Write an enzyme that holds these catalytic residues in place. Structure first.
Site, PDB file in Angstrom:
ATOM      1  N   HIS A 192       0.840  -1.198   0.000  1.00  0.00           N
ATOM      2  CA  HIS A 192       0.000   0.000   0.000  1.00  0.00           C
ATOM      3  C   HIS A 192       0.871   1.242   0.000  1.00  0.00           C
ATOM      4  CE1 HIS A 192      -3.135  -2.823   1.177  1.00  0.00           C
ATOM      5  NE2 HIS A 192      -2.340  -3.219   2.159  1.00  0.00           N
ATOM      6  N   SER A 205       1.013  -0.327  -5.429  1.00  0.00           N
ATOM      7  CA  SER A 205       0.240  -0.613  -4.259  1.00  0.00           C
ATOM      8  C   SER A 205      -0.303  -2.056  -4.362  1.00  0.00           C
ATOM      9  CB  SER A 205      -0.890   0.391  -4.193  1.00  0.00           C
ATOM     10  OG  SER A 205      -1.487   0.372  -2.918  1.00  0.00           O
ATOM     11  N   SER A 246      -5.933   1.743  -1.551  1.00  0.00           N
ATOM     12  CA  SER A 246      -5.118   1.972  -0.330  1.00  0.00           C
ATOM     13  C   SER A 246      -4.078   3.084  -0.526  1.00  0.00           C
ATOM     14  CB  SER A 246      -4.448   0.648   0.123  1.00  0.00           C
ATOM     15  OG  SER A 246      -3.462   0.203  -0.798  1.00  0.00           O
ATOM     16  N   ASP A 288       3.179  -7.601  -0.173  1.00  0.00           N
ATOM     17  CA  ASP A 288       2.108  -7.619   0.811  1.00  0.00           C
ATOM     18  C   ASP A 288       0.867  -8.236   0.194  1.00  0.00           C
ATOM     19  OD1 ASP A 288      -0.364  -6.536   2.166  1.00  0.00           O
ATOM     20  OD2 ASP A 288       1.119  -5.650   3.529  1.00  0.00           O
ATOM     21  N   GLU A 292       4.695  -9.814   4.000  1.00  0.00           N
ATOM     22  CA  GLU A 292       4.256  -8.957   5.100  1.00  0.00           C
ATOM     23  C   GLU A 292       3.021  -9.503   5.798  1.00  0.00           C
ATOM     24  OE1 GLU A 292       5.376  -5.566   5.740  1.00  0.00           O
ATOM     25  OE2 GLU A 292       3.663  -4.857   6.975  1.00  0.00           O
ATOM     26  N   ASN A 322       5.469 -11.555   8.549  1.00  0.00           N
ATOM     27  CA  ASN A 322       4.267 -11.448   9.396  1.00  0.00           C
ATOM     28  C   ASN A 322       4.546 -11.999  10.766  1.00  0.00           C
ATOM     29  OD1 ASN A 322       1.221 -10.910   9.722  1.00  0.00           O
ATOM     30  ND2 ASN A 322       1.331 -13.068  10.283  1.00  0.00           N
ATOM     31  N   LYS A 326       5.809  -7.829  14.470  1.00  0.00           N
ATOM     32  CA  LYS A 326       4.865  -7.566  13.392  1.00  0.00           C
ATOM     33  C   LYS A 326       3.489  -8.092  13.788  1.00  0.00           C
ATOM     34  CE  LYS A 326       2.585  -7.417   9.391  1.00  0.00           C
ATOM     35  NZ  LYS A 326       1.214  -8.020   9.125  1.00  0.00           N
ATOM     36  N   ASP A 365       1.360  -4.682  14.738  1.00  0.00           N
ATOM     37  CA  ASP A 365       0.646  -4.270  13.540  1.00  0.00           C
ATOM     38  C   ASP A 365      -0.747  -4.917  13.471  1.00  0.00           C
ATOM     39  OD1 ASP A 365      -0.408  -4.707  10.778  1.00  0.00           O
ATOM     40  OD2 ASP A 365       1.550  -4.163  10.007  1.00  0.00           O
ATOM     41  N   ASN A 366      -0.827  -6.239  13.423  1.00  0.00           N
ATOM     42  CA  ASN A 366      -2.131  -6.875  13.112  1.00  0.00           C
ATOM     43  C   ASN A 366      -3.174  -6.579  14.198  1.00  0.00           C
ATOM     44  OD1 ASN A 366      -0.058  -8.034  11.559  1.00  0.00           O
ATOM     45  ND2 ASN A 366      -1.103  -9.995  11.310  1.00  0.00           N
ATOM     46  N   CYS A 424      -4.961  -2.414  13.788  1.00  0.00           N
ATOM     47  CA  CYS A 424      -6.395  -2.431  13.566  1.00  0.00           C
ATOM     48  C   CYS A 424      -7.158  -1.774  14.691  1.00  0.00           C
ATOM     49  CB  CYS A 424      -6.915  -3.869  13.313  1.00  0.00           C
ATOM     50  SG  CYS A 424      -6.173  -4.586  11.802  1.00  0.00           S
ATOM     51  N   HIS A 459      -8.946  -9.738   3.886  1.00  0.00           N
ATOM     52  CA  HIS A 459      -8.223 -10.003   2.646  1.00  0.00           C
ATOM     53  C   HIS A 459      -9.131  -9.888   1.457  1.00  0.00           C
ATOM     54  CE1 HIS A 459     -10.154 -13.849   2.163  1.00  0.00           C
ATOM     55  NE2 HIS A 459      -9.318 -14.255   1.224  1.00  0.00           N
ATOM     56  N   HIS A 519      -2.998   1.870   9.153  1.00  0.00           N
ATOM     57  CA  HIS A 519      -2.327   1.920  10.440  1.00  0.00           C
ATOM     58  C   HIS A 519      -1.474   3.174  10.550  1.00  0.00           C
ATOM     59  CE1 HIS A 519      -3.717  -2.081  10.718  1.00  0.00           C
ATOM     60  NE2 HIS A 519      -2.586  -2.757  10.760  1.00  0.00           N
ATOM     61  N   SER A 529       6.613  -2.957  11.772  1.00  0.00           N
ATOM     62  CA  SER A 529       6.518  -3.904  10.673  1.00  0.00           C
ATOM     63  C   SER A 529       7.594  -3.687   9.631  1.00  0.00           C
ATOM     64  CB  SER A 529       5.185  -3.735   9.954  1.00  0.00           C
ATOM     65  OG  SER A 529       4.133  -3.991  10.848  1.00  0.00           O
ATOM     66  N   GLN A 582      10.898  -5.423   7.713  1.00  0.00           N
ATOM     67  CA  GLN A 582      11.010  -5.545   6.234  1.00  0.00           C
ATOM     68  C   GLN A 582      12.426  -5.195   5.804  1.00  0.00           C
ATOM     69  OE1 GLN A 582       9.606  -6.662   3.685  1.00  0.00           O
ATOM     70  NE2 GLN A 582       7.452  -7.005   4.185  1.00  0.00           N
TER      71      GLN A 582
HETATM   72  N1  NAD Z   1      -6.281  -4.536   6.980  1.00  0.00           N
HETATM   73  C1  NAD Z   1      -5.160  -4.578   7.752  1.00  0.00           C
HETATM   74  O1  NAD Z   1      -4.492  -3.578   8.048  1.00  0.00           O
HETATM   75  C2  NAD Z   1      -4.612  -5.964   8.119  1.00  0.00           C
HETATM   76  C3  NAD Z   1      -3.596  -6.043   9.073  1.00  0.00           C
HETATM   77  C4  NAD Z   1      -3.023  -7.285   9.382  1.00  0.00           C
HETATM   78  C5  NAD Z   1      -3.455  -8.466   8.757  1.00  0.00           C
HETATM   79  N2  NAD Z   1      -4.476  -8.372   7.786  1.00  0.00           N
HETATM   80  C6  NAD Z   1      -5.104  -9.527   7.091  1.00  0.00           C
HETATM   81  O2  NAD Z   1      -6.233  -9.838   8.004  1.00  0.00           O
HETATM   82  C7  NAD Z   1      -6.561 -11.276   7.840  1.00  0.00           C
HETATM   83  C8  NAD Z   1      -6.498 -11.916   9.219  1.00  0.00           C
HETATM   84  O3  NAD Z   1      -5.148 -11.898   9.759  1.00  0.00           O
HETATM   85  P1  NAD Z   1      -4.808 -12.445  11.186  1.00  0.00           P
HETATM   86  O4  NAD Z   1      -3.332 -12.128  11.374  1.00  0.00           O
HETATM   87  O5  NAD Z   1      -5.816 -12.030  12.198  1.00  0.00           O
HETATM   88  O6  NAD Z   1      -5.049 -14.004  10.876  1.00  0.00           O
HETATM   89  P2  NAD Z   1      -5.300 -15.099  11.987  1.00  0.00           P
HETATM   90  O7  NAD Z   1      -5.155 -16.377  11.292  1.00  0.00           O
HETATM   91  O8  NAD Z   1      -4.530 -14.793  13.244  1.00  0.00           O
HETATM   92  O9  NAD Z   1      -6.841 -14.862  12.423  1.00  0.00           O
HETATM   93  C9  NAD Z   1      -7.895 -15.312  11.559  1.00  0.00           C
HETATM   94  C10 NAD Z   1      -9.049 -15.819  12.412  1.00  0.00           C
HETATM   95  O10 NAD Z   1     -10.125 -16.074  11.488  1.00  0.00           O
HETATM   96  C11 NAD Z   1     -10.755 -17.225  11.997  1.00  0.00           C
HETATM   97  N3  NAD Z   1     -11.622 -17.765  10.922  1.00  0.00           N
HETATM   98  C12 NAD Z   1     -11.325 -18.449   9.808  1.00  0.00           C
HETATM   99  N4  NAD Z   1     -12.473 -18.771   9.145  1.00  0.00           N
HETATM  100  C13 NAD Z   1     -13.494 -18.270   9.835  1.00  0.00           C
HETATM  101  C14 NAD Z   1     -14.877 -18.267   9.668  1.00  0.00           C
HETATM  102  N5  NAD Z   1     -15.457 -18.850   8.589  1.00  0.00           N
HETATM  103  N6  NAD Z   1     -15.632 -17.625  10.586  1.00  0.00           N
HETATM  104  C15 NAD Z   1     -15.090 -17.046  11.664  1.00  0.00           C
HETATM  105  N7  NAD Z   1     -13.758 -17.053  11.861  1.00  0.00           N
HETATM  106  C16 NAD Z   1     -12.950 -17.657  10.973  1.00  0.00           C
HETATM  107  C17 NAD Z   1      -9.590 -18.155  12.307  1.00  0.00           C
HETATM  108  O11 NAD Z   1      -9.990 -19.279  13.140  1.00  0.00           O
HETATM  109  C18 NAD Z   1      -8.587 -17.187  12.940  1.00  0.00           C
HETATM  110  O12 NAD Z   1      -8.597 -17.201  14.416  1.00  0.00           O
HETATM  111  C19 NAD Z   1      -5.512 -11.817   6.872  1.00  0.00           C
HETATM  112  O13 NAD Z   1      -6.095 -11.683   5.602  1.00  0.00           O
HETATM  113  C20 NAD Z   1      -4.357 -10.838   7.005  1.00  0.00           C
HETATM  114  O14 NAD Z   1      -3.530 -10.750   5.865  1.00  0.00           O
HETATM  115  C21 NAD Z   1      -5.046  -7.127   7.508  1.00  0.00           C
HETATM  116 NA    NA Z   2      -2.049   5.994   8.401  1.00  0.00          NA
END
Ligand code: NAD
Ligand code: NA
Ligand code: NAD
Ligand code: NA
Ligand code: NA
Ligand code: NA
Lengths: 488, 485, 485, 488
Positions: free
Chosen positions: C62, C85, C90, C139, C205, C230, C235, C239-240, C244, C350, C404, C412, C416
């Protein structure tokens, strides 16, 4: 004389008492010493007013729960020159070591944990029985039982004076009131002008709690209030601290001691979202319970929702909840009908008032029900229909005082500094005409004073307004800082 | 901007930034309505009876999407309306545009100059030869101030022919106000007298303005009845508290995108606004330090696990400063000079004097760099480090974001509607003196009740037996007069 | 937009929305630097030695102000850089512009079409006749995907002359990817072979992309070494989670201005992202309901006082829905049809398939109304009620706000930089196989240590006697390999 | 025979025990019944495995704190067919009513609250002394004391076998180790091959806590570990629940019972921000204390700051803080030098390990210092320099178990279901070769299983993946759901 009659004992110095075990006095003293440090408001009161002995010659009867906290209060009154007699305002709230230390060192006390209702009302009578020199001059009350006894006393004395007739318990079907009428009846045999002398002499009562205060305004409204009253509950540094933060501390303490139940992960229902309910909801939420609130007041209800709590009627959640707490000051909140729908080992308790928020009467008489005492003030009532139970704390009476130790010293210092200020006011104006047979609250500058006395202990550093600034917001530099109707 | 009113096809005056934003305004107003059940319920209850039929209402209240729903509630109830914003940066231009197009005369835009601000205020009060307003909705008291000052100027002028002299004040803004009154005297020496004779009353929204009103009552200068809307429980204990808990972080994030978690944030004041700001910051993972003058509020803060210190003890440590006091001279130049590079400084309280903007702007060798509108970095010559000032020290939530959300403004604004209806309905009855009043509890409770269904909150109903037991009517009011909630 | 690269005066290619936004970009980058001590420390430590001298790095991440600081860290260390990106919404256009002007080839803008997105990806990989990249920062794995698919297409084409056929997929987006590879074959049938022979490695990432990588390792198709960024503690657990907790509410407030307090919010998933989103929502005064498939995560939620239910149990009650799963088909059309009027539906996980966007867009008689960019109201014909979809179901934090904040992205992104330096420094040593690796703990700990001074966090130092007692070196690593923090 | 010798007693059925008061057994039983309902993991284990009696013929020695929770564990082992002997792993942690109920009904138990160190090591020896039929086959250990005794035993037995010489306490200046060496020495007189037979027979040990686990890996590293070990601490459904949420419950419980101090308004220092420290910081913060963290680990430190907590060194805050909690598993965290700088009635406690996080030795020998016991496990130590005190809980030993009741049943069900699973594994593989003299962790599918067993009780409804979905994230529908290195 009954083989089991209740008899006062006397210290070596001839001061009356009745407590569980005098041998607990050293222990009491050790914990009182610790409490003093946690109660800077009361200790500063001793420093400021001790030397002038403002309560010299004053006789004070009190009913606040006979805890270590109340001990520090009692000893503040005596440090200011008061003579004191005390009882607890609840059958389960006394801390026996606190009672013993006070009885030994400072005041007549009639109190023990695990009183019968008969013993409770006896204790109340003794706290009020000053003997031939008369008294009290001043009352400290919590829940209004003492105040009620005096008012029912004067009534019974007027009937007696005018017709020679005595009260008759058969005249009431309320089991506790039967007790009260019997006490008054026997009292008429020993001093049939006890209460009338009292009402000519009492300078005032300071009342500690919301339910008590409500009783007082009723008595004012219908013209029966016999003397001045200070409403201590509605000082900000009481209502917004004791009722709120105190419960936030002592609700979880009561649950943990009584049941050792994990609160996290559970569903907890809090009936009422006033100050007590706000504090209870907070504790539960903070501990990781999912809290559902019941309410009748839409403003309070809306407040609960803004704090991310679900608001429903009890009926909606009764079969699902793990823990139920009543905080309403109302009656008939959790009825037998509800209790029958609760899951096995649901915990049910009351932190509001009296014994009637939970339907203990209906529970008692549920056919086939079996009460199993786990330990003192933790009872499992087994429903035959299901062979499941519910866990009732403190027999439906205040669970925080009954199952643990109530509020901690620091917050009670806030409440009890108000009590001291209230007593000093009533007393200092004994001859003034300033207070009538009505209910009064303390002025804001004294409310602020109580808060200020407690800041240093916590290391909180207050900012001082410049003249310029005080002018700008139109308050004096030394306060008060807020308008009369400010809600904090 | 040319300070010349424009007019709709129908002949209604307005001045806004950009009328083409009306469609966008309307789309957001349509969403806001759903979030404002108190206001929509008021339209359904009172619509048929048109209680404001024939009323002329002037309002001075941030011209946001939320205000738009309020305006459109007054007009649905039959009112004719003129409006201006009560802050130079708080207008949402699409809201302004939609209202100007569809519903009411509006003089407002984001980024007014002080001269423009006061011009808009005058226009909002200018009902022409006909006269008006009958009613005033005020936020912060500027409109109310203008009428009171004008009347005072008129009484002097009538006698001695003397004009207000801007030299009589060192306040740059008040000079403007004095000059505005002087010019008005040179056209109509009785404008404000006529106005004040016609105003049925004012309903004031904010803590500061309400404070001004009681003072006016005290010193006997208040010209007409006033309803204190701030001190409705469903205003003070919701808007001022929960509103800021929402809009303070919104403002910070929009203006700077700074991470709040892990930082040290100072909140000056711990009243309703400070309570809400401190909540937001702590909930976001900031370590919050509170300043206070009131020992009761300070004790409240400590009980919430917050440190209470003087500003002087933390000025070089804090990352974020928020003023919530309604007082002046909270954060002075001498404080700012000690702050770390890129410390964020903002005000959510009142006016522009909580922070020492004057001292800052006049500091020799200081340099201002605009990062973007309402986010300014000031660099000091002594240190060559900077601080970040939000919205030139004016209300940061409205300045840098969108202020409070619709749901909580529905609570405040439903109170505004009730207050207006009360004043107008009693215009002829002599019920209200030239004093300050608050709404009764049953009405305060009605406002709350109107917002519960939306959140799926189900109330319990007292049995008659229970209502008797606690000595309240089944239908309330449920609490004593002095209850603090 | 004309899909024709432009060039700086110096001959560097770019395509962005608006170069005039560069000044504004730079002002915000300057602020971001102060908030990103990990990245600035990396410049000071490695600047003098120019470890990236002669490296060609492609990044797909992004194009935000935060990424800009990362890019400018790589270039400070001597790298030549091309960037795109990894999401159509984004990009922050001022960030893009400043980088394009001052530091690196950038192909990115907010509001790309899918065709544009993939075109930008190709440009970012196109180092011309010379060849490249040496290194990839990825990413979500799209860039990595493109190279692997291309190589596979090239091996087939070389033999049978067969082209990728978009008919072979029903995925609208993948059709685009297939068509892009087909066109590439018609110009240079060995593009991706040459590319893959030259790539020293990729550092990925995000959770989803990392998942893709391990799968590739398993099935033996991974073409070059990969570092899983990740799963650095500094990270994943920052970050995650904390990212959020900041950016989810930011997105919601910007896009809708809805009050969160008092509402019911559903968070699908309770991993790192779901934990952070649920935190934000609960801290804002929402009542949060969590869905999960993992009983351990579900138990974690209940221990945090959150209700755990299936979506089906709450679909008509919730006001706000957030998907955090990294899975597909979380919120289907059949769910959406049951939602209350103006329920807010968004994805922070995602891609675009957590929410049933396809099912929604193709629902007969459905109508889409754009409130404003990335806030859409869809009205169903059966009910004549609507829902609000954020960012067309793509990452809502980046789509509707700014993702973020800088401080947490410094954590994060410092990872990298370390990962890139590791790959590049070991380019010739054979240390890394065609497998997926994670950074060692001492490095993960270094990243944390680099961010403490900024927050004034003072660490205790072990005595030798204490270090011996718990069997760790005074200077660490402090925890066992499997420690979960 | 010593006039004061410690002697075992026997039930009417001839099972050995030593407990405080057998008459507490009915009370024990009542609370065990309540606990069972709060421990669905253990109860489901009984249902699933009871009928097949997988522990038939197995002898299990355990050291977990002898609480009501441990009782439900013990009775799960016996329900599965095990024979059991038990001791507590801490001098203050036993709940006497739990000990009595188990001794009466289910197993040999040597445990009481308020043991001396000598009595503690005796109890450990008895729990391990199976008599002529030999044993144990299996060990459940918490903190590694039992395991240590066996390993020091085998060493002492080798010296004995080869040179005939006995241990000599004079050989060590560590007061507790002197005790251990003396126990082994007297043990050599009764069975000088006790530990060698043990080490040829023991199938494995399952170890519960972080400190114990660290001891095991050391023993593996230096090649001294005598048998297989399962690291129960590092199951997710242990470490991330018990260590975290358990302390969040039991830290404030310990403080409240021991001191009744208000936590709100105070400054509290938490040394360490691992799982225990995270849970303690949370409780304190949730209760309205301002929490300052100390740490050596920058990742943990950074986590604390993100949760809005100040991170400083102890020296920075020692004079200002009201409450100090150690959570480190390290030594020498709060030294005499620090204690001398603390304010009057600062509360000082340890929830980590052993007795050496707080410098109790230096405190003991501080000249002029005076220890004043307020009540059991609450001691005020008065510093003569200042005439002020500090309040030490549980003599520097685990304060939650010592001053209250430790963790609640529900979270211990998570921990103890892991223990059961661990014991079943060791035992089921007694003849397999699958486990070597190393430390192992349980696989993820069993970790998930433990969590699943506890969801229903809380009404948590789990979503089921479609095949399509499970394919998409590449996990089986029935799990495991996360990668090997997932941190949760
Ligand atoms: N938008 C952002 O800034 C941002 C930041 C970090 C990660 N991400 C993305 O967010 C997503 C989640 O990342 P994460 O690190 O939390 O992953 P994670 O694996 O730690 O958490 C995912 C959770 O989803 C649950 N899950 C799976 N299928 C499900 C369903 N059908 N119903 C309910 N729950 C279900 C899993 O059991 C798991 O606990 C990934 O796509 C990751 O790349 C986005
Ligand atoms: Na920002
Ligand atoms: N921006 C918004 O959306 C918004 C919303 C509601 C109210 N307001 C305005 O915010 C201001 C505060 O309102 P409130 O309702 O919280 O008022 P309040 O009176 O309840 O709280 C003000 C607090 O400031 C404290 N204070 C005064 N001088 C101080 C000083 N020098 N240092 C530290 N503290 C000091 C007071 O003791 C008081 O507790 C007013 O100007 C009000 O109009 C703004
Ligand atoms: Na107490
Ligand atoms: Na808004
Ligand atoms: Na326990």
């Amino acid at each position: 004389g009954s083989h089991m009659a209740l008899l006062v004992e006397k210290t070596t110095s001839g001061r009356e008492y009745k407590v569980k075990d005098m041998s607990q006095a050293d222990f009491g003293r050790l914990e009182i010493e610790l409490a003093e440090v946690e109660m800077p408001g009361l200790m500063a009161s001793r420093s400021e007013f001790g030397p002038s002995q403002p309560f010299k010659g004053a006789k004070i009867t009190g009913s606040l729960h006979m805890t270590i906290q109340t001990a520090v209060l009692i000893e503040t009154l005596t440090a200011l020159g008061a003579e004191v007699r005390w009882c607890s305002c609840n059958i389960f709230s006394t801390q026996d070591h606190a009672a013993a230390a006070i009885a030994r060192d400072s005041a007549a006390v009639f109190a023990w944990k695990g009183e019968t209702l008969q013993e409770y009302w006896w204790c109340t009578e003794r706290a009020l029985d000053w003997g031939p020199g008369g008294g009290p001059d001043l009352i400290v009350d919590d829940g209004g039982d003492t105040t009620l006894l005096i008012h029912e006393g004067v009534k019974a004395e007027e009937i007696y004076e005018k017709s020679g007739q005595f009260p008759d318990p058969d005249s009431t079907d309320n089991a506790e009131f039967k007790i009260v009428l019997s006490i008054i009846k026997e009292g008429l045999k020993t001093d049939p002008k006890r209460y009338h002398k009292m009402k000519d002499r009492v300078v005032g009562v300071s009342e500690e709690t919301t339910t008590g205060v409500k009783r007082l305004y009723q008595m004012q409204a219908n013209g029966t209030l016999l003397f001045p009253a200070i409403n201590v509950n509605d000082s900000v540094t009481k209502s917004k601290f004791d009722n709120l933060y105190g419960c936030r501390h002592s609700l979880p303490d009561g649950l943990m001691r009584a049941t050792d139940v994990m609160i996290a992960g559970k569903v907890a229902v809090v009936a009422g979202y006033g100050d007590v309910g706000k504090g209870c909801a907070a504790a539960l939420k903070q501990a990781g319970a999912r809290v559902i609130v019941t309410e009748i007041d839409p403003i309070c209800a809306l407040q609960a929702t803004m704090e991310g709590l679900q608001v429903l009627t009890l009926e909606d959640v009764v079969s699902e909840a793990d823990i139920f707490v009543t905080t309403t000051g109302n009656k008939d909140i959790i009825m037998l009908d509800h209790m029958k729908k609760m899951k096995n080992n649901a915990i049910v308790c009351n932190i509001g008032h009296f014994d009637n928020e939970i339907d203990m009467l209906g529970l008692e008489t549920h056919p086939g029900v079996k009460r199993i005492t786990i330990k003192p003030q933790t009872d499992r009532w087994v429903f035959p229909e299901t062979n499941t139970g519910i866990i009732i704390l403190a027999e439906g009476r205040l669970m925080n005082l009954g199952c643990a130790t109530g509020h901690p010293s620091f917050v009670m210092s806030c409440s009890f500094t108000n009590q001291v200020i209230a007593q000093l006011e009533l007393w200092n104006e004994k001859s003034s005409g300033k207070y009538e047979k009505k209910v009064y609250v303390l002025p804001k500058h004294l409310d602020e004073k109580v808060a200020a006395l407690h800041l240093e202990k916590l290391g909180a550093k207050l900012t001082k307004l410049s003249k310029d600034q005080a002018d700008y917001i139109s308050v004096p530099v030394e306060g008060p800082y807020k308008p009369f109707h400010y809600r904090y």
